[PDB]
């Protein structure tokens, strides 16, 4: 768990935005202590109006494309895993499904040549993912299983670094913001992303005090 | 039970208005001891002319709308639960009826898709509520069952924080005001409301001494 | 017997909801002392309008399915015990009927291969259960014996953690709530469930004071 | 006599199951004091619905097989003692009948080579056992003497560790369970068995409170 | 929170006006302690007749113009985002709507080419802003939604540095002035503005003592 | 028993993955203490959703092939031990059956020339292995004895380094993961394997915190 203390905007105490190291596949937790800034502003503390933004400062575009499939409940799904690796050069394709990042409500039998069968778990209808690795390069395959009636919609293909939709909170009693920071298994080591956090305090009549800071998430491998 | 002692207006002993923590769904009790202020004013003590006012200092507008239905006595009532959640984004709707806040004189069978049947209890005609939770966000559905003749009127859709119409009292013998403070199940944690209390003492000829104070009700979750 | 004291809602004295350890198969007893909250509210104490709700915070879906059978009075019942274990992988099936959780008004002779004979006790018509263990994983088989005339209805397949329908009580004389907490033999160790209790006090004119708390039931093995 | 106090399920005070040392041939007595658990549950104390189960955690399969014979009343019985020791290797067979574990209503004259004559006691018809030791390894021979009319049935070949069918009792006046624990003379030193006890208390209306614990019986030699 | 102590005008203890660092988008709080000047003037302390003035000492004129639109309640509003960037040179226009400074009661879907749709939030009539960034340079777009009857007036296009209309106060009990200092998201880093504060004390007959000071607000980026 | 403490992901304190020495034939135990990482994440501790993966970083392909045979219950089984050693060069074949790794429910009489007789233990039907050593190089022979009816399936030929299917556990009370690490007798000294462990903590609402680490298992001989 990371713990940061914010700069208190007094006119007093290498880059601008502080650093967060991350490993592909992890889901860590970050705590930010606004006490130094929001305590002198004697009021009602923090509020749940935080806003986050992720932007890449170094990306290294991915090699293998992601893909989306669709199936009804109970019916076995097939698909290919070879049109997802447009290769520039000449080489062979060691298709691989890592057991750490396999599916969640199904099973996949990787074939001999870029083929795989996803038998969805019986009595289940939702969305399911798994992360393949075509020759070292990792991507994800997203399958949505329908409840036999119409058709399911299409989920947004998880990004390398993300901040879960609603797992954030603030205790106005001690001025501490908690949020989760998850790294996809397809994040390439060496990249750098930037997270900007806009947090509002509140004065005792309910007006607003805004505070902005950033963090530099550097995707490392091996910790 | 909260117990507050009022400031005695002598010229002597972070915000202005003191604090009251509240949890969604509770109904607590508050006691205020005017002894320090109204005892030196040797007279006939307090009177039952208290006035309350609720105002929000932080609200976080609700996501799901509330709704009103109507039915005659004995006839089963249907309705929908999907036009009450205008969603900005793309997501699914896990309609839920909490058993803690179910109906009071009926039964509701939540369907598969935002549908529900409220069979009113036999030999009963009044108003009945229940609190649904469309994907975490809570609202209320109000149904009024008519005694088969004309039509019932329309109740005012309980607010997040309220002070029951008539459950207040004052013992002029010890200068203590009692009132109840109820929090709706739809109050969003982190909000802050402000309650202003205007209490009149009385002098021994029947003239008036007014006293005003506030309390800051901060809707917390988990106590 | 667990004994909890409730927080008195004064504005004064790791998770939110306190903890209850449980062992699969037990049936324990819990006592909650509302004295700290309901005594200052000088009135008629607690009432028998408690409401409970169980929700899982970690479930670990079961491997072996449960099953339901039916038989008339006196006639011996057969059934299979092999279509209740859809296995992903390749392995053998050591069908087992634990003597601690055998039937109650019958006898079962487990066969060599997933077969069993439930001879219902003579002159008896009701419902009867027993808990099998197909290769470590436990489920229940429910049989209903009919009184030879029509057909019996179908009971609801006991859940991992439950609170018996009517074994709850409150002594308004000392503000203490008693209830029973039972754990099915199929509860998987390591899971966590959450119990929410909504208890109403009453004021001396019969109005209501609601109080809500939770408890985190963590299914442990070996105590 | 062993005396155990049970853990009271309060959320308070190397393996899970406590230990019982046992010596081959003994028959000891065990007392369990449920006072710490069943006294707060003010009710009608314990009931005589205890259930036991024995399972091996280490067995060391026996070398010499057991055997069953049959004879009518008064007629002398012969048998062999050499087809009961399938030996892997080459060695000689020192057949021995220990005087501590001889027969009970007969006499046996061990021959020179694995032969023996069991002359049943005159005017007696029942079942009779004796424990031989073919080269250190112990087994039992069971003979049933018939009352000259038909044929006697076949008894179940006593296990290494057992809990006698009906010698158990509970005093609801002090919450103490008594049971007997017997070890066969053929139990191999160093083994470990596990005994699980399921004891029910009862509430004052007759409902049930279940309690489960285990004990690890470690077959030692020499105490 | 900034805290300044004023010079006491005794004839005793690089630029003239002290310094305040500011970051684009923030809203901070400033406290000025007139105790050193207004305490010797034994009287009735400070009064709420403070006057502020903002003047730029370095501005760096903006590149992209701001804009104003108008719409009635409920009707979706369109507009362009390309006539707001008169470019001197040849380059492309990466239109961007930052999520930190998006709208407040609507939603905007930025198109492919400088187009955007602002669907106002249902049941809402007021003014709404959002800050776009045409190729690094930031400006604001102001939309006013009318309550279907006539037409709304036109708000004054928030300046880079401002002092909120009425959030200022003075405690005559300790001679401390509080005011808020907000920085627009379009303030260009490196600029310098000057704030002049004219504060009046009061003598015990109600006459006046004026005091003037300045502060140099230097718009920095990254704190 | 190995004991590792995990790195706590704070941004603070030759290869990446730590080291585990192993000896062919052993079965050791490993303990990992997640306290440093999962304790600050005040929640419900670890869960039983660990995932392991073994991959070789140096293998040294085996010389002698493994083999599979089949027999019914009670019938003696023959087989050869010479087509399992395709030799490149010219040399003789000192067939050997180590007594440390002999069979478990049978006996094998190694012949003069690569022949052997496996007489299965009477009254036994399962799978049985033994490890031969054709001229220093070790492999395994797997025999499955059928219960005379149909045919048994075919077990998966144990790998050099493995992690037993279900002998893993986690005590959420002290944040410690236990698992077993077994090394086959055919592991070649000097090889290196890599074990990756993916462990999930859980927050107090039941969401997830993932943690990944590796260990480098270096097959040594003589400790």
Numbering used by the authors:
A (entry chain 2), B (entry chain Y), C (entry chain m), D (entry chain l), E (entry chain n), F (entry chain 1): 1 to 13, 21 to 230
Sentences reproduced from the published study:
Caudovirales, the taxonomic order for the tailed double-stranded DNA bacteriophages, is characterized by the presence of a tail—a host cell attachment organelle that is connected to the genome-containing spherical or elongated capsid via a neck. We describe cryo-EM structures of the neck, the neck-capsid and neck-tail junctions, and capsid of the Agrobacterium phage Milano. The tail to capsid junction involves a symmetry mismatch that is bridged by the neck, and is therefore crucial for the assembly of tailed phage. The extensive network of disulfide bonds within and between neck, collar, capsid and tail provides an exceptional structural stability to Milano.
The 15-fold, 12-fold and 3-fold symmetrized maps of the neck were used to build atomic models of the collar, portal, and neck devoid of capsid (portal + neck 1 + neck 2 + tail terminator + collar), respectively. The Milano collar is made up of four rings of gp13 pentadecamers (15 × gp13). The gp13 subunit contains two β-strand-rich jellyroll-like domains. Domain 1 (residues 1–69, 167–230) forms the wall of the collar, and we thus named it the wall domain (W domain), whereas domain 2 (residues 70–166) decorates the collar wall, and we named it the decorating domain (D domain). DALI search results suggest that the D domain of gp13 is structurally similar to glycan-interacting and cell surface binding proteins. Four collar rings are stacked and stabilized by complementary electrostatic charges on the interacting surfaces of their W domains. The W domain of each gp13 protomer is covalently linked to its neighboring subunits by four disulfide bonds, one with each neighbor within the same ring (Cys23-Cys229) and one with each neighbor along the left-handed 12-start helices (Cys22-Cys211). The collar of Milano is structurally distinct from that of T4 and XM1 bacteriophage. In contrast, the Milano collar consists of four rings (4 x gp13) surrounding the whole neck and displaying no fibers or spike-like structures. An elaborate network of disulfide bonds in the collar suggests that they play a role in the overall robustness of Milano particles against mechanical stress, supported by the observation that this stability is lost under reducing conditions.
